[PDB]
Design an enzyme around this catalytic site. Structure first.
Site: not given
Ligand code: HEM
Ligand SMILES: Cc1cc(N)nc(CCc2cc(CC[C@H]3CCCN3C)cc(F)c2F)c1
Ligand code: HEM
Ligand SMILES: Cc1cc(N)nc(CCc2cc(CC[C@H]3CCCN3C)cc(F)c2F)c1
Ligand SMILES: C[C@H](O)[C@H](O)[C@H]1CNc2nc(N)[nH]c(=O)c2N1
Ligand SMILES: C[C@H](O)[C@H](O)[C@H]1CNc2nc(N)[nH]c(=O)c2N1
Ligand SMILES: [Zn+2]
Lengths: 416, 414
Positions: A116, A285
């Site tokens: 974020r 990314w």
């Molecule tokens: C720019 C580089 C970004 C990186 C490195 C990043 C990294 C991550 C990682 C590692 C997670 C954990 C989810 C998982 O492991 O499955 C996550 C969750 C999440 N990311 Fe980011 N993200 C990025 C950009 C964004 C953007 C652009 C958005 C939306 C505008 C976003 C929204 C979210 C949301 C909503 C979650 C929650 C996932 C959930 O509740 O299941 N991310 N992010």
């Molecule tokens: C934009 C962006 C950048 C980045 N580096 N990585 C991501 C992926 C993170 C991500 C993953 C999930 C589902 C994963 C969960 C759901 C149920 C089973 N899986 C454990 C939902 C998300 F909204 C989200 F952001 C997104």
């Protein structure tokens, strides 16, 4: 009422007042912590005029506060205009400015997102004029091309029309815009990404001709205005992929691994001032561990630990040789090496967690808090040698937000 | 209200009904999760006559239920007998049976403990007849010797007299029975264990003669009946230590690393039936990562990562080489290798977390659930390749319990 969080490595203490602006519920009670429940009923998403104007009013109050116009005539007229549009049409439309602010703050409020620090640099693509699945395909192609940017990734989100009566939803049926197919073989084994078997079968049934390879990019399955979804192949020249090699192990390339460069989540719901955007693909990314640890090494995914450990010739007999941990690190070194070598944007988990700590501290100072889900922020390897492990974090829900929603194939009424 | 937990690696789903018996509070609300707060005000700890009997009844009720005598003569008799003793003495005493049950179940209820599959095999040492720090020392040496068992470690707890009026508290001032000293160097940094610098001061600052080495076993600082605490040195032949070498890198031994075999937590408060046992040192055996990941590699601890990566000649120019991760694995390989070689009991994080899943399964089946704190159950390395990572857990506070308590020096009416 104020709340303090402590970093047990640096003894830095931060005071959260922002949690007072929390509306939604966590899932916890005074007597149970549901902090590790993955998709509690509160994180998942039929909404009447009754509750909508309060939700509108609070969003607009936030919006006009951020632009230092709270209580201005522009602010009051907008409230007025929204009020009448709700009672007249049961919903309302966001201005472009409000949409951009909403989408950015939804990300800013995503307590599980370690990425974020980047939240203010979000390219918002307004696709609310879209009406057909073909038009969705075009918007998504342009998103993918802009976001990829030849490897120099840019965060983007594309926002399709909001829900109305929930009977005319726009949905992207793919969990992510770019994902590999998974095929259940008759012998019980899986070819490709085991996490995508169910989706792959839907596509095949919808008429997709599956190449049945280990790394087939899935077609887009797109639902516009509540109609039956339609298949579209993303043009291959738009799907940037990185062959995975290891900087010291020459045999690693021969494992035949590759991954796509653009992580783009396409199945979540964007809530802004009470409006529900059921189709809002967003992308950024990768953090290296998302591919190296989860995608490749989860037992329920590609699960290459065994093969990688075999080729490193590790002691695989007892677990206490930590052969699993040794291979995991090498696979994650390869992911990072391959992306950097190909000049595809990627961040390692050390850099990303340090950045998030700085972001979080900055947010406490300028905003009064930063909601954060420790269970999700800590990386899935080497947790305690990243500085977030030692960081107390308060988890609460602010709006605008991204919410989960049921997979559309479970709720959709098929037309034929 | 009848809750489900899902494992996302296996799709196994357990139904928790045990949480409905929960009594204490978590620190969370509907508006805010505090699941990652180290010490909320609930997990830390005089009892009045009105608060004590309900606490005793609830404990005795579950006790006589566990022995299949709920609603029995003996149950009602004990209930009235404790009821009479409270009304009279403003407290009461546990029968040895209830004490052993109470201790075992405080462990069983420790939602942050990954080793609880062993909970029923706890060796309880009743030290309630103890009256002096010399006495406390004797009980603690007997505990250490019994628990160590020449490297074939056995779980044990030693329970000193319960709190009375908070003026006669028994406390072990050490946080663990066995810990290495920490001295701040004139030239800035910290020699030995930095977590222990204040305590290492209070020892010297109360009479200790410090070797000022890097791995000096701290002395015991024992407080009986609320008196000034006293220094005692654990006999060195009772402190089993493991020199840390690597099964591949012969230079590893030259790092001069060692650790003690006995993890023995001594600063917690054991609560049974409303009674507060402020001195209740307990011990088991290490999960490898506790030493290798946290003790050796935390930046606020021995922080040997940079030195080890140097000796491996890894590319420490950029964090993306994952040299920290590479070294962390090697260090943890060595800890396990050394303990195993010296036949000192140790469990690796893969083995312990698998065991805990089995234990969860067991508890949901035979008890209706298992309170568990994901933030603490997931090992501090390789989290997602262990089964606990994908296991949803419900965290709630059951009693009997182990609780935190203020550091004595802040409290002791000196
Ligand atoms: C720019 C580089 C970004 C990186 C490195 C990043 C990294 C991550 C990682 C590692 C997670 C954990 C989810 C998982 O492991 O499955 C996550 C969750 C999440 N990311 Fe980011 N993200 C990025 C950009 C964004 C953007 C652009 C958005 C939306 C505008 C976003 C929204 C979210 C949301 C909503 C979650 C929650 C996932 C959930 O509740 O299941 N991310 N992010
Ligand atoms: C934009 C962006 C950048 C980045 N580096 N990585 C991501 C992926 C993170 C991500 C993953 C999930 C589902 C994963 C969960 C759901 C149920 C089973 N899986 C454990 C939902 C998300 F909204 C989200 F952001 C997104
Ligand atoms: C037998 C082998 C045991 C193993 C392998 C083990 C493992 C662990 C680990 C890894 C932790 C995390 C705490 C940290 O990382 O510092 C922990 C916490 C804990 N253990 Fe166990 N443990 C064992 C035995 C015991 C015994 C015998 C008791 C008491 C009878 C006990 C009670 C606790 C408690 C109360 C906590 C958490 C303290 C808190 O609430 O913060 N453990 N254990
Ligand atoms: C018997 C036993 C076996 C075993 N394998 N490991 C242990 C030690 C683990 C442990 C640690 C702590 C507090 C340390 C906290 C306090 C603040 C800084 N640290 C996070 C309390 C405990 F009760 C406890 F068991 C004990
Ligand atoms: C802030 C956070 O609660 C703190 O770092 C916790 C995280 N999880 C932990 N888990 C274990 N097992 N031991 C610990 O010391 C911690 N520390
Ligand atoms: C049960 C548990 O909540 C689940 O496995 C979560 C834990 N933390 C996670 N953290 C991240 N970043 N991604 C995940 O998929 C998960 N899964
Ligand atoms: Zn909680």
């Amino acid at each position: 009422r104020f709340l303090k969080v402590k970093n047990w490595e640096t003894d830095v203490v931060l005071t959260d007042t922002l949690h007072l602006k929390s509306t939604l519920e966590t899932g916890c009670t005074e007597h149970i912590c549901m902090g590790s429940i993955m998709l509690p009923s509160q994180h998942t998403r039929v909404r009447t005029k009754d509750q909508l104007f309060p939700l509108a009013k609070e969003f607009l109050d936030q919006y006009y506060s951020s632009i230092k116009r709270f209580g201005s005539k522009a602010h009051m007229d907008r409230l007025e205009e929204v009020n009448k549009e709700i009672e007249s049409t049961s919903t309302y439309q966001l201005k472009d400015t409000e949409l951009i602010y909403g989408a950015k703050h939804a990300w800013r409020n995503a307590s599980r997102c370690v990425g974020r620090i980047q939240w203010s640099k979000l390219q918002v693509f307004d696709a609310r004029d879209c009406t057909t699945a073909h038009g969705m395909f075009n918007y998504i192609c342009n998103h993918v091309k802009y976001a990829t940017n030849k490897g120099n990734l840019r965060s983007a989100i594309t926002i399709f029309p909001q829900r109305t009566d929930g009977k005319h939803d726009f949905r992207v049926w793919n969990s992510q815009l770019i994902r590999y197919a998974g095929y259940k073989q008759p012998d019980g084994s899986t070819l490709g990404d085991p996490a995508n078997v169910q989706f792959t079968e839907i596509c095949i049934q919808q008429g997709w001709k599956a190449p049945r390879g280990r790394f087939d990019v899935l077609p887009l399955l797109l639902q516009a205005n509540g109609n039956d979804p339609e298949l579209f192949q993303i043009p291959p020249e738009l799907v940037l992929e990185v062959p995975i090699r290891h900087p010291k192990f020459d045999w690693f390339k021969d494992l035949g691994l590759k991954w796509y460069g653009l992580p783009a989540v396409s199945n979540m719901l964007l809530e802004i001032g009470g409006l529900e955007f059921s189709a809002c693909p967003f992308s950024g990314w990768y953090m290296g561990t998302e591919i190296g640890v989860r995608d490749y090494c989860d037992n329920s995914r590609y699960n290459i630990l065994e093969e990688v450990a075999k080729k490193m010739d590790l002691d695989m007999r007892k677990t206490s040789s930590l052969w699993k941990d040794q291979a995991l690190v090498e696979i994650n070194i390869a992911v990072l090496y391959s992306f950097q070598s190909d000049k595809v944007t990627i961040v390692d988990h050390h850099s990303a967690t340090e950045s998030f700590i700085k972001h979080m501290e900055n947010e406490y100072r300028c905003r009064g808090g930063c909601p954060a889900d420790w269970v999700w922020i800590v990386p899935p390897m080497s947790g305690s040698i990243t500085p977030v492990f030692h960081q107390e974090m308060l988890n609460y829900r602010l709006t605008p937000s991204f919410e989960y929603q049921p997979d559309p194939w479970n709720t959709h009424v098929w037309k034929g």
